[PDB]
């Protein structure tokens, strides 16, 4: 109604790219000799993938749209992308895959925040 | 730390039961002759299943626990269970499966709210 | 080891695009005046999204790779993309969104089959 | 039609219990001092959770039922529960949580196999 269809499309594409980035990054950190120091990073990637996957699906549905549901789901996705971007950024010096995943998390956080701002 | 482990267990069990309830209820409303009047109900069941599935997974992980992430995910799950309980309750007179699913949604909403209250 | 890394990347990208296509197509058919005639289409889109989502995740993980697991998951994803491409193709005359989703299903079926063939 | 409704119900309940078991077991092995030796176990738990989640959803839908899709999805779930039961069984001496998860994987493998056998 008042919603930016382009910002909605961007959010959906970002959630799918970020979910896959975090799935791949959990697996990549799992395979590091350093894995013992990367456990919060792996766990946060797992959460971030689960929430981005759910958010992409909810935002993809227009039938019987409920702003309360959509707002609460975007907030959850913003919050986990922010936490996961921070955690991967701390591992960025130990692995190029975490630098890349941190960028994905930050990009998706911004896409959720931009949509959130428009209601 | 200050968290009720029993309330956490209840939330996880409720999310899985509620996700399956809503998957089954979307399918059941799809198969109703009335389906044309049950479209918001079906869509809300789809969202409610996706969010309960993600919430069960996030709450099942203790490594590198982040209260900000967990709070935002429980809020999203509470909000969608409340919306989906309301929508199925409106269809309760048209199908026994919606009365049952409304109860599941209300039960999981209360489990998320009770955990949320404890932080 | 003997695996085509490029075919693996293509499969992952196709599963995510196809999962979102089928989520959107279930929602689009839900919103059609015709919805009563589109119920198998909607149900198949739901399955196809769930299986493409799981397949993208499994194929994204290289740690402790098991060809038996990967083969069985690619087979499931091929089979549901084939069924869902066929079902959306039958609705293609009733809605442009089903023609588009049928193409996505066929594209992902071929990506899974091509990877399957390489083991 | 010829399907055991009770075996279908058991499969659905087992997939949800096994998905949560494997989510919890990935997290538990992540938190072990031994984590470096538990990486295949963690990865297999991640796959096993993703596939059990998708299988529970597909088996929960009766509208426009397709035996080809259902068979291929049950096969994938059987195969990953068998691989994940074996991998957790190897860690059973290092952690009680893996002994418990191995039992869940074996229980769900048998539920999928029993349904598969009935078509
Ligand atoms: Cu998004
Ligand atoms: Cu995201
Ligand atoms: Cu991500
Ligand atoms: Cu990583
Ligand atoms: Cu990491
Ligand atoms: Cu990470
Ligand atoms: Cu992440
Ligand atoms: Cu994420
Ligand atoms: Cu997201
Ligand atoms: Cu996010
Ligand atoms: Cu991260
Ligand atoms: Cu990384
Ligand atoms: Cu990372
Ligand atoms: Cu990331
Ligand atoms: Cu990451
Ligand atoms: Cu992320
Ligand atoms: Cu993200
Ligand atoms: Cu986002
Ligand atoms: Cu977003
Ligand atoms: Cu819960
Ligand atoms: Cu729930
Ligand atoms: Cu539910
Ligand atoms: Cu329903
Ligand atoms: Cu309903
Ligand atoms: Cu419903
Ligand atoms: Cu629901
Ligand atoms: Cu729910
Ligand atoms: Cu929940
Ligand atoms: Cu909920
Ligand atoms: Cu509902
Ligand atoms: Cu119902
Ligand atoms: Cu319902
Ligand atoms: Cu419900
Ligand atoms: Cu419901
Ligand atoms: Cu619900
Ligand atoms: Cu619920
Ligand atoms: Cu809940
Ligand atoms: Cu909850
Ligand atoms: Cu794929
Ligand atoms: Cu696919
Ligand atoms: Cu698709
Ligand atoms: Cu459609
Ligand atoms: Cu359709
Ligand atoms: Cu469809
Ligand atoms: Cu589809
Ligand atoms: Cu699919
Ligand atoms: Cu796929
Ligand atoms: Cu597929
Ligand atoms: Cu389709
Ligand atoms: Cu369509
Ligand atoms: Cu379609
Ligand atoms: Cu499709
Ligand atoms: Cu489709
Ligand atoms: Cu498809
Ligand atoms: Cu597909
Ligand atoms: Cu595919
Ligand atoms: Cu594929
Ligand atoms: Cu099952
Ligand atoms: Cu299972
Ligand atoms: Cu399991
Ligand atoms: Cu474990
Ligand atoms: Cu383990
Ligand atoms: Cu494990
Ligand atoms: Cu497992
Ligand atoms: Cu499993
Ligand atoms: Cu299963
Ligand atoms: Cu399984
Ligand atoms: Cu296992
Ligand atoms: Cu374990
Ligand atoms: Cu285990
Ligand atoms: Cu297990
Ligand atoms: Cu396990
Ligand atoms: Cu398992
Ligand atoms: Cu299992
Ligand atoms: Cu099973
Ligand atoms: Cu099963």
Question: Is the CB of C46 less than 8 angstroms away from the CB of B26?
Answer: yes
Instruction: Say which experimental method was used.
Output: X-ray
CA distance B115 to B117: 5
Of B24, B57, B60, the CB nearest to D60: B24
* CA distances, A26 to each of B77, D6, D52, D88 (Å): 24, 37, 19, 19
Q: Please give the Cα distance from C113 to C65 (Å, whole number).
A: 19
Is the CB of C53 less than 8 angstroms away from the CB of D50?
Answer: yes
CA of D49: which chain B residue's CA is closest? B57
HSE-up (13 A, CA, CB side) for residue B30? 30
Contact A98, A22 (CB under 8 A): no
Q: Where are the alpha helices (DSSP H) in D31-66?
A: 39-59
Q: Tell me the nearest-neighbour CA distance from B31 into chain C, angstroms.
A: 7
* CA separation for the pair A54, B72 (Å, rounded): 14
**Does any CB of chain D come closer than 8 Å to the CB of residue B46?**
no
* Contact criterion met (CB below 8 Å) for B16 and D48: no
Tell me the longest C-alpha to C-alpha distance in chain D.
Answer: 51
Residues in A touching D45 (Cβ below 8 Å): none
Interface test with A, best of B48, B72, B87 (most A CBs within 10 A): B72
Q: Report how far residue A54's alpha carbon sits from residue A70's, in angstroms, rounded to the nearest whole number.
A: 11
Q: Resolution of the coordinates in A?
A: 1.2
Closest among A115, A46, A69, A53 to B75, alpha carbons compared: A69
**Inter-residue contact A43 to D27 (CB < 8 Å):** yes
For residue B95, the surrounding DSSP H or E stretch is: none
The answer to whether the beta carbons of residues A23 and A51 sit under 8 Å apart is no
Neighbours of B86 (CB within 10 A): 15
B22 with B101: CB under 8 angstroms? yes
The radius of gyration of chain D from alpha carbons, rounded to an integer in Å, stands at 15
Q: How far is C-alpha D59 from the geometric centre of its chain's CA atoms?
A: 14
Q: What tokens appear for B65 in the block? A: 């626990």
CB D4 within 8 A of CB D94: no
Helix C39-59 crosses helix B5-30 at what angle (to 10 degrees)? 140
**What does the alpha-carbon distance between residue C80 and residue A112 come to, in Å, rounded to a whole number?**
31
List the single residue in D31, D43, D46 with the smallest CB-CB distance to A39: D31
User: What is the dihedral sign for C-alpha C99, C101, C105, C107?
Assistant: positive
Q: Which residue's structure tokens are 């799950």?
A: B77
Burial of B13 (0-12, 13-18, 19+ CB in 10 A): middle
Contacts D49 to C, Cβ<8 Å: none
What's the token pair of residue B111? 């489990």
Q: List the Cα angle B91/B92/B97 in 5-degree steps.
A: 100
Q: CB contact, 8 Å: B72 with chain A?
A: yes
Show the tokens assigned to B87: 């929508």
Of A20, A17, A1, A5, nearest in space to A115 by CA: A5
Residue B72's alpha-carbon distances to A28, A83, B78, C25, in angstroms, are 27, 12, 10, 29
Q: How far is A39 from chain B (nearest CA, A)?
A: 7
C33: enclosing H helix or E strand: none
CA dist C24 and C84 (Å) reads 13
- Which chain C residues are closer than 8 Å to B36 by Cβ? 33, 35-36
B40, A32 in Cβ contact below 8 A? no
Task: State whether residue A8 sits within 8 Å of chain B by CB.
Answer: no
CA–centroid distance, B25 to ligand 34, in Å, is 5
Tokens of D61: 């839908």
Pull the structure tokens for residue A24.
């791949």
Q: CB B39 to CB C26 under 8 A? A: no
C-alpha to C-alpha distances, C9 to C13, C20, C57, C67, D1, nearest whole angstrom: 6, 17, 12, 16, 40
Q: How far apart are alpha carbons D56 and D10 in whole angstroms?
A: 10
Phi-psi region of D64 (alpha: psi -120 to 50; beta: other; left: phi over 0): left
Q: Which of D27, D56, D60 sits opposite B63 (nearest CB)?
A: D27
E strand or H helix at D15, and its extent?
Answer: helix D5-30
Tell me if residue A65 falls in helix, strand or coil: coil
Alpha-carbon radius of gyration of chain A: 15
Contact assignment for D31 to A46 by CB distance below 8 Å: no
Q: Which of D49, B86, C2 is nearest to A53 (CA)?
A: D49
Helix (H, G, I), strand (E, B) or coil at B97: helix
Report residue B111 CA to chain centroid gap.
9
Cα–Cα nearest to B46, from C117, D30, C25, D5: C25
Relative to the alpha carbon of D25, which ligand is closest? 61
> Residue A55 and residue A15: Cα distance in Å, rounded?
7
CB pairs < 8 Å spanning A and C: 44
Tell me, yes or no, if A62 comes closer than 8 A to chain C by beta carbon. Answer: yes
Q: What's the CA dihedral at A98, A102, A104, A107 to 10 degrees? A: -170
Alpha-helical runs (H) found in chain B? 5-30, 39-59, 67-91, 96-118
Under 8 Å CB-to-CB from C82, ≥6 apart: which residues?
C105, C109
**Contact flag B72-A75 (C-beta cutoff 8 Å):** yes
Neighbours of B, requiring at least 3 CB pairs below 8 Å, are A, C, D
D94 within 8 A of D25, measured Cβ to Cβ: no
Cβ-nearest to D20 among B24, B56, B63: B56
Q: What tokens appear for B61 in the block?
A: 């992980």
Chain A residues within an 8 Å CB radius of C23: 56-57, 60-61
Q: Which two tokens stand for residue A2?
A: 């008042």
Q: Which of A52, C28, C53, A106 is nearest to B39 (CA)?
A: C28
- Closest-CA distance, A86 to chain C, in angstroms, reads 22
* CA distances from residue A21 to A85, B54, B93, C108, D36 in whole angstroms, order as listed: 11, 17, 45, 19, 22
Give the count of beta carbons closer than 10 Å to the beta carbon of residue D22.
31
Neighbours of A2 (CB within 10 A): 6
Displacement of CA D55 from its chain's centroid (Å): 9
N residues, chain A: 119
**B31 and C46: CB-CB below 8 Å?**
no
Whether B107 contacts B14, CB under 8 Å:
yes
For residues C26 and C16, give the distance between their C-alpha atoms in angstroms, rounded to a whole number: 15
SS3 D66: coil
* Distant-in-sequence, close-in-space partners of A87: CB < 8 Å, separation ≥ 6: A40, A41, A44, B64
């Amino acid at each position: 109604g008042g919603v930016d269809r382009e910002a909605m499309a961007r959010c959906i594409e970002e959630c799918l790219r970020c979910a896959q980035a975090c799935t791949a990054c959990a697996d990549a950190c799992l395979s590091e000799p350093t894995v013992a120091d990367l456990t919060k990073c792996i766990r946060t990637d797992m959460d971030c993938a689960d929430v981005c996957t759910a958010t992409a699906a909810v935002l993809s549905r227009h039938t019987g749209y409920d702003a309360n549901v959509t707002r609460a789901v975007l907030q959850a996705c913003a919050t986990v992308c922010a936490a996961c971007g921070d955690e991967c950024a701390r591992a960025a010096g130990m692995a190029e895959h975490c630098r890349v995943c941190a960028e994905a998390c930050r990009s998706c956080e911004q896409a959720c925040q931009e949509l959130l701002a428009g209601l």
